[PDB]
Amino acid sequence: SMEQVAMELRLTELTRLLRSVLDQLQDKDPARIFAQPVSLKEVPDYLDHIKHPMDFATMRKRLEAQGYKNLHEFEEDFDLIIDNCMKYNARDTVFYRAAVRLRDQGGVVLRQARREVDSIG
């Protein structure tokens, strides 16, 4: 149907906007602490601690399969990255501190993304 195509075009355009959001967020992580999944070879007990692991590469895979239907879904995954880190790592660590800086900086980017997703529909 033409309606299915139109909905597909909207999803494609959302995907384009989320790809630019994802690039902007990841620049706020210059140390690449959140670039890849926590390694189960190097942190073998991780899944006893964190039930839903997340990282930027895993988000990128989902994005390129047009797997985010809306910005809420994408923000959920970004918040998992931060929240998982702040539970697993103590306050006095480079890891926790990197998450706080990513949260604070990413908040700005996400504030205007929400307006752009509403605005452009």
CATH code where residue 103 lies = 1.20.920.10
What token pair was written down for 86? 């702040």
CB 23 within 8 A of CB 78: no
Query: How many Å is the Cα radius of gyration of the chain?
Result: 16
Specify whether the CB–CB gap between 80 and 62 falls below 8 A. Answer: no
Residue carrying structure tokens 């073998």: 44
Among 78, 90, 65, smallest CA distance to 15 is for 65
Which secondary structure element, helix H or strand E, spans residue 79, and what is its range?
Answer: helix 71-88
- Per the structure, the count of domains in the chain is 1
CA dist., res. 91 & res. 86, Å (int): 7
Domain residues for 44? Answer: 1-121
Query: Which residues have CB under 8 Å from 100's CB, separation 6+?
Result: 86
CB 55 within 8 A of CB 38: yes
Q: Which of 34, 57, 38 is nearest to 49 (CA)?
A: 38
Report whether 86 contacts 100 (CB < 8 A): yes
Please state the φ and ψ torsions of residue 65, each to the nearest 5 degrees: -90, 15
CA distance 94 to 90: 9
Q: Kindly give the residue spans of alpha helices, DSSP state H, lying in 27-51.
A: 46-49
